[PDB]
Amino acid sequence: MTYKLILNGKTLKGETTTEAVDAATAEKVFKQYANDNGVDGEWTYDAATKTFTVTE
Numbered sequence: 001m002t003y004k005l006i007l008n009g010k011t012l013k014g015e016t017t018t019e020a021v022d023a024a025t026a027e028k029v030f031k032q033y034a035n036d037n038g039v040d041g042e043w044t045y046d047a048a049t050k051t052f053t054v055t056e
Contacts, residue, residue, distance in 0.1 A: 001019065001020055001021060001022060001023070001026065002017070002018075002019060002050075003017070003018055003019070003020050003023065003026035003027075003030065003050070003051075003052060004016070004017040004018075004050075004051045004052065005017075005018075005026075005030040005034070005051070005052035005053070005054055006051070006052070006053050006054065006055075007034060007037065007039050007054055008053070008054060008055040008056075009037075009038070009039040009041075009054075009055070009056045010041075010055075010056040012037070012038070012039055016030070016033070018030065023045070023047075026052070027043075027045065027052060030052055030054070031043070034054050039054060039056065040054065040056065041054070041055060041056035042054065042055040042056070
C-alpha cells in the first residue's frame with residue numbers, strides 16, 4: 001500500500017514516501033526511520049488523504 005509521510009522535524013524538514021502492506025506497518029516503518037533520523041514528537045495521519053504527517 002503506497003504511503004507518504006512528511007518529515008517536518010523542528011529544524012530538519014523532508015518529505016518521504018514508501019510501500020507497506022497496511023497503514024500500521026507503514027507508520028511503524030515511517031516511525032522507525034523517523035526515529036532513526038532523530039525525527040518524531042507529533043504524529044498526525046488521515047485516511048482521506050492517505051498521507052502521514054510528523055513534526056517535533
